[PDB]
């Protein structure tokens, strides 16, 4: 049988097992968000609102819930080589803007990025929280410029509700697996307090769905 | 005038290819014809190391062939005594995004890094009895794909900014930098004598560097897709590259040529880890087909299967004495095979 | 690394006292602790032991019962409550830190010690009590066990300590062959099962003292009579 | 533009090495395998007496 | 007639086959897989094992006695077959409630799940439930409530003695275990329909609540009589028709395989390993 020294080593190993168990239990209830976006999409304002080289980290708390938001815009090497490391994040925060509907085209790049990250093998059951930033000014942008630049299939109206609805349904009609994942969509307003509340509600819904799947009760 | 530069470069490339092909050479499989195949290779899971709660991404055997360090995205570096499956150290990490881990040849230090663009050095043999950070080597502008301990005071790092660096732990400064890759350098392998090393990137090419000299010596372009793993032959005169083309290839440093290809039609998925045996007679390729294959390196035929993993086989290592082979997958399990 | 110890002194027989050891310089939570006696003109005597996290506690045969030992990680302190102090526990007490994992060096650090002045074991023999030593010669100290210390896992649980006059003992060799950190390479350990030898090559100053051979095969830990070396 | 001349110089300096026949290199590659055969525990099944696992 | 005597055999053999297959598959899935070894599945295993307890000794013996119009073995074998069938029944109907509470204080009270349902805490809850089962079935020794009824062709509970064992077993085996199911599966469904309303301006009722209340409608027709044969059977026995009675006691037995079905081939976590082990072997 074991000696004294290796018995003490086994005791140390068991203690390490216990501590690792507590750290894993603590980190299993961490709401993980992956912030994305094409460029000049105004996600800096988003992280600024939530807060008050390499990938940058943000941590905060909301209603007894700890959120870790990972912003990976600083690593322009290759998504296909490290995007699988984020398999397991609670949600993906896409922050396409609405003041770039004509400037370079850029809306098409954002839609291409949405297709690339949504119809992805790693993110099949991972929900996506779409954010439509810069809402409060394309209202007066479309008082001069029309939507005909962005969309050849639209000739309806240069009004806030109509353009917002068309962009909403256009981005929604981009995911093929309309059952394994849901795309909550927001219309980020003039620095209103609801921006964090919407994220909290969406992540609570995602957590409830994940728990139901885990129990088999779904 | 720049077209003249391009024309000279392409003429030199064509001449190098002609010199390679026209060595009056012969196929490797022809020479290794009348040798006895190793037969069916059966390895049983002697030990199963449990305790990781997330997809592990790298492991490294200690030079004593008993202690192994494993890194996982749960932000923990675990050092296991493989003989008794005992955890001897659990090091928390500043950044949970870790994809690298190295074990120093002397065993005093370890290193780990990832998407935070640094692989810090941890000192294990501390008087205070804990594990503390020795240095934070910074200066890369991309996620570190692999850093390997060249010495007790020197490390070699390969990141996703199309370059590699050689560091000095005493001063934490880039002693030498190596450039020439046009893609994310994904794998790094050190020679047995730690005089040369080989870096494999996403441009479907591999390069041989001299650490003390500091520039590319040989370049190999045989693969099609990204190269994810490279391991030296134990003799140091050859190396094997595993790619996403579902094929591994044996490359010859002596001849600057391609020696053999290990491709089977039933496999269409890439290779995440490649390692040899002590004598270089078995090449252990860790596919993302949820299993590992053992190829008879000389005869190129598959010798055995090491199935028993419930996810992609991420990391693979072989002890220096060749006593056992350890495989770690995304199911957070380490398996020892003997 | 500091282990400052207090609480000793004069107690009549049948009295009670508490010995405290405050640790400052390391991670007290992970380290196991030992309390070790030494009679005023005799050798070391293992007394107690606490593992990390106070999971397992062992006591010596002669002190089990009346003696109790405890640890408090919050303020990094180790307590030994002594009751029914007979006129035999008058001694010099030390607290010894020890970490147990593959490749560790137990008993590496020793406290300065306190003084109390009360008003089926592996017997180990050191054949030499005193021996003259030339200040420029190599000398061998032989220890002899009763039960073979070579365990089935290949480890020989033999430890060699050195105590200089007026100072706490320091670990020289652990597991019969490995030199402790900071120990000059003049010391070597060799031998075989139930016959062990510490060799000092090119002896010089700061090598005089008393050398103790201790077993760690199983509790209770026991020492030798100690060999006195004089120039 | 300087990258072009850098690549030209690299290709110039990576074209003066000695290249042996692949036949001889393969022979030397298998000589190592057939000389270290007995030191391969995973290749030849070593008796269970001296397996630490 | 022979048609009904064969129908009972058909029902019992289907129950045995399903109860063996589903429970064995659950046990293998827990054993082979490592991600399913959490504290939420242990209460499922205690439900599976219990359902196997009745599927091995009692049910095949009832199949051995059903063909005949009499009894084969005798004194001590029937008395232990009954005392084991009853134990399995109460254990299953108690682990159903255990799983309901585990799911409730994992979805609704998610914060407390780590400490209330740790590895050691669940390991003692599954033994508390079991000891309660053997403390509730135990009075069969001295009370002698186990008899072989030619009325039913099985060694079962006797309602003719201790009118109060029955009431006390009805109001603790049927009346109570359904309140904790209709409260722990109706509160999860009203909570999952409340989070959706928070962001936005139905076959999930059947999928998440109805399939888990089925045990309360198979056990009703037997316990429905239980509150009628607890009225001094010496006054109410010649009122209950056999036609409904036999159909009753067997609706309960079927619950033995119904629970295995619902906690097997409705959890995708278990079905994935079911397919993975069917392909394996
Ligand atoms: C509750 C659900 C899930 C299962 C229902 C099972 C029912 C349909 C099965 C199980 C036992 C069967 C009964 C067994 C005994 C009898 C009594 C006999 O005189 C007529 C047939 C009859 C009435 C059978 C009818 C069908 C029956 C009641
Ligand atoms: C109390 O121990 C036993 C013993 C045998 C049993 N057979 C059945 I079906 C049950 C459960 C139903 N009980 C009633 C009155 O309906 C049972 C319980």
XYZ file of C-alpha atoms in Angstrom, chain B residues 29-331:
303
model
C 8.454 3.711 -50.463
C 10.692 1.852 -52.918
C 13.553 1.601 -50.417
C 11.279 0.684 -47.487
C 9.739 -2.177 -49.469
C 11.120 -5.384 -47.933
C 10.753 -4.460 -44.262
C 8.322 -6.102 -41.883
C 5.243 -3.997 -41.047
C 4.830 -3.341 -37.341
C 1.511 -5.204 -37.360
C -1.630 -4.316 -35.472
C -0.800 -1.887 -32.658
C -3.105 -2.103 -29.637
C -2.739 0.436 -26.825
C -4.957 0.471 -23.743
C -5.857 3.489 -21.638
C -3.643 2.846 -18.618
C -4.614 6.086 -16.867
C -7.295 8.731 -17.360
C -6.462 12.128 -15.869
C -9.637 13.982 -14.889
C -10.112 17.390 -13.317
C -10.234 19.786 -16.246
C -13.651 21.388 -16.721
C -13.138 22.785 -20.233
C -11.646 21.911 -23.609
C -7.911 21.457 -23.086
C -5.727 22.839 -25.858
C -2.149 21.763 -25.127
C -0.065 19.453 -22.984
C 3.661 18.922 -22.615
C 5.606 16.040 -21.102
C 8.383 16.728 -18.645
C 11.884 15.567 -19.482
C 11.686 13.099 -16.588
C 8.809 11.436 -18.503
C 6.664 11.422 -15.369
C 5.179 14.913 -14.925
C 2.987 16.506 -17.583
C 1.490 20.001 -17.745
C -1.917 20.571 -19.334
C -3.656 23.829 -20.250
C -7.380 24.406 -20.724
C -9.673 27.356 -21.392
C -10.990 27.184 -17.831
C -7.941 29.284 -16.905
C -5.997 26.545 -15.107
C -2.615 24.935 -15.727
C -2.558 21.493 -14.109
C 0.649 19.543 -13.519
C -0.003 15.814 -13.179
C 2.150 13.010 -11.840
C 1.250 10.572 -14.605
C 2.332 7.510 -12.619
C -0.306 8.031 -9.905
C -2.694 10.527 -11.586
C -1.890 13.007 -8.817
C -2.193 16.752 -9.283
C 0.971 18.415 -8.005
C 0.251 22.020 -9.061
C -2.764 24.054 -10.179
C -1.743 27.466 -11.534
C -4.498 30.030 -12.179
C -3.991 32.239 -15.218
C -4.635 35.937 -15.758
C -6.272 35.218 -19.131
C -8.399 32.095 -19.516
C -7.741 32.106 -23.287
C -4.687 29.841 -23.319
C -3.642 27.646 -26.242
C 0.039 27.078 -25.387
C 1.946 25.311 -22.650
C 5.594 24.326 -22.345
C 7.563 22.506 -19.665
C 11.158 23.568 -19.128
C 13.846 20.922 -19.738
C 15.133 21.518 -16.205
C 11.579 21.437 -14.833
C 11.894 24.700 -12.903
C 9.590 26.819 -15.079
C 6.552 26.476 -17.310
C 5.083 28.855 -19.873
C 1.585 29.538 -21.132
C -0.149 31.997 -23.421
C -2.862 32.564 -25.965
C -5.163 35.263 -27.320
C -3.687 37.777 -24.846
C -0.565 37.940 -27.088
C 1.804 36.954 -24.244
C 2.916 33.610 -22.833
C 4.003 34.281 -19.263
C 6.600 32.214 -17.412
C 5.710 30.552 -14.103
C 8.356 29.484 -11.586
C 7.466 26.179 -9.927
C 10.422 25.597 -7.576
C 9.808 28.600 -5.332
C 11.029 28.981 -1.760
C 7.667 30.479 -0.746
C 5.994 27.206 -1.759
C 3.573 28.608 -4.353
C 3.808 29.199 -8.103
C 4.467 32.795 -9.136
C 4.863 34.616 -12.435
C 8.509 35.074 -13.378
C 8.204 37.187 -16.530
C 5.500 38.501 -18.857
C 7.090 38.379 -22.313
C 5.304 41.018 -24.397
C 5.931 42.368 -27.876
C 3.911 40.125 -30.168
C 0.957 41.605 -32.050
C -1.006 38.373 -32.329
C -2.169 35.333 -30.431
C 0.766 33.093 -29.541
C 0.363 29.771 -31.326
C 3.205 27.967 -29.531
C 6.120 28.870 -27.271
C 8.706 26.185 -26.494
C 11.474 26.349 -23.890
C 14.728 26.414 -25.838
C 16.661 26.642 -22.557
C 16.175 27.525 -18.906
C 16.683 31.193 -19.858
C 15.582 31.199 -23.520
C 12.185 30.578 -25.109
C 10.984 30.533 -28.720
C 7.531 31.957 -29.441
C 5.402 31.684 -32.587
C 2.300 33.869 -32.819
C -0.375 34.788 -35.340
C 1.407 37.906 -36.597
C 3.380 35.962 -39.242
C 6.576 35.970 -37.191
C 8.527 34.168 -34.484
C 10.655 35.551 -31.670
C 13.458 34.357 -29.408
C 13.340 35.727 -25.872
C 15.670 36.058 -22.896
C 13.842 35.446 -19.624
C 16.413 37.404 -17.598
C 15.663 40.649 -19.457
C 12.332 39.843 -21.122
C 13.466 41.197 -24.493
C 13.300 39.765 -28.008
C 16.854 38.558 -28.579
C 16.097 37.631 -32.200
C 13.071 37.787 -34.485
C 12.343 35.556 -37.478
C 10.233 36.767 -40.398
C 9.235 35.411 -43.782
C 5.930 33.648 -43.211
C 2.917 35.163 -44.972
C 0.386 33.686 -42.552
C -0.301 32.877 -38.930
C 2.597 30.727 -37.726
C 0.609 27.883 -36.183
C 3.198 25.317 -35.071
C 6.768 25.361 -33.779
C 9.093 22.402 -33.229
C 12.581 22.431 -31.720
C 15.446 20.213 -32.814
C 16.750 17.633 -30.319
C 19.944 19.681 -29.887
C 17.973 22.979 -29.780
C 20.197 24.422 -32.514
C 17.589 24.652 -35.296
C 13.811 24.722 -35.289
C 10.923 24.552 -37.742
C 7.884 26.825 -37.964
C 4.699 25.984 -39.841
C 2.206 28.676 -40.791
C -1.120 29.064 -42.580
C 0.477 29.789 -45.973
C 0.803 26.008 -46.519
C 4.568 26.233 -46.043
C 7.139 25.386 -43.392
C 10.455 27.084 -42.690
C 13.683 26.051 -40.966
C 15.393 28.643 -38.765
C 18.725 28.741 -36.961
C 18.273 30.351 -33.549
C 21.914 31.420 -33.168
C 22.061 32.730 -36.763
C 18.558 34.119 -37.201
C 17.326 33.639 -40.763
C 15.506 31.081 -42.880
C 17.592 28.211 -44.252
C 15.117 25.889 -46.001
C 11.488 26.279 -47.056
C 9.030 23.458 -47.762
C 5.831 23.863 -49.806
C 4.106 20.496 -50.066
C 0.814 20.915 -48.241
C -2.418 22.454 -49.520
C -4.284 23.785 -46.473
C -3.086 25.264 -43.184
C -0.352 23.434 -41.271
C -1.497 22.924 -37.682
C 1.205 20.689 -36.179
C 4.860 19.816 -36.786
C 7.159 17.396 -34.968
C 10.818 16.571 -35.544
C 11.998 13.077 -36.258
C 14.060 11.879 -33.266
C 17.200 11.837 -35.424
C 16.608 15.524 -36.169
C 17.188 14.973 -39.900
C 13.481 15.007 -40.821
C 10.124 16.256 -39.608
C 6.431 15.578 -40.135
C 3.789 18.212 -40.857
C 0.102 17.731 -40.112
C -2.263 19.981 -42.027
C -5.975 20.589 -42.517
C -5.731 18.763 -45.869
C -6.380 15.525 -43.905
C -2.863 14.417 -44.914
C 0.384 14.341 -42.963
C 3.665 14.624 -44.844
C 7.224 13.605 -43.994
C 9.778 16.233 -44.995
C 13.527 15.780 -45.379
C 15.873 18.465 -44.093
C 18.752 16.662 -45.815
C 17.171 16.788 -49.286
C 14.735 19.743 -48.993
C 12.142 17.360 -50.431
C 8.893 15.527 -49.666
C 9.423 11.924 -48.564
C 6.026 10.370 -47.816
C 2.332 11.210 -47.490
C 0.013 9.500 -44.994
C -3.450 9.870 -46.526
C -6.391 7.478 -46.257
C -9.617 7.960 -48.194
C -11.754 7.375 -45.094
C -10.257 10.543 -43.541
C -11.353 13.968 -44.789
C -10.762 15.963 -41.600
C -7.594 17.751 -40.562
C -4.806 16.881 -38.144
C -4.450 18.826 -34.899
C -1.364 17.099 -33.458
C 1.559 15.058 -34.793
C 4.237 13.230 -32.818
C 6.745 10.438 -33.367
C 7.902 7.497 -31.277
C 11.226 7.145 -29.479
C 12.730 5.340 -32.482
C 10.641 7.215 -35.048
C 8.959 4.015 -36.238
C 5.435 5.138 -35.286
C 3.888 8.485 -36.220
C 0.952 9.360 -33.967
C -1.433 11.757 -35.716
C -4.282 13.249 -33.720
C -7.202 13.839 -36.053
C -10.331 15.812 -35.235
C -12.240 12.636 -36.181
C -12.637 12.074 -32.404
C -9.774 9.547 -32.571
C -6.032 9.235 -33.109
C -4.172 7.186 -35.699
C -0.789 5.487 -35.452
C 0.918 5.231 -38.840
C 3.873 2.991 -39.570
C 6.208 5.817 -40.550
C 8.517 3.752 -42.758
C 5.870 1.808 -44.700
C 3.297 4.674 -44.594
C 0.445 2.271 -43.781
C -1.810 2.877 -40.810
C -0.714 0.647 -37.935
C -3.379 1.246 -35.306
C -6.204 3.345 -33.919
C -6.387 5.016 -30.510
C -10.126 5.666 -30.392
C -11.844 6.375 -27.098
C -12.152 10.160 -27.161
C -15.536 11.891 -27.242
C -14.379 15.039 -29.068
C -11.613 16.421 -31.273
C -8.151 15.257 -30.208
C -6.529 18.626 -29.558
C -3.116 17.797 -28.083
C -0.799 14.805 -28.219
C 2.571 14.038 -26.668
C 5.063 11.203 -26.307
C 7.479 10.764 -23.413
C 11.206 11.017 -24.075
C 11.777 7.382 -23.094
C 8.771 6.318 -25.176
C 7.053 4.589 -22.264
C 3.610 6.017 -23.027
C 1.709 8.401 -25.291
C -0.716 10.945 -23.849
C -3.694 12.337 -25.762
C -5.898 15.220 -24.698
C -9.177 16.121 -26.372
C -11.862 18.785 -26.109
C -13.815 16.547 -23.710
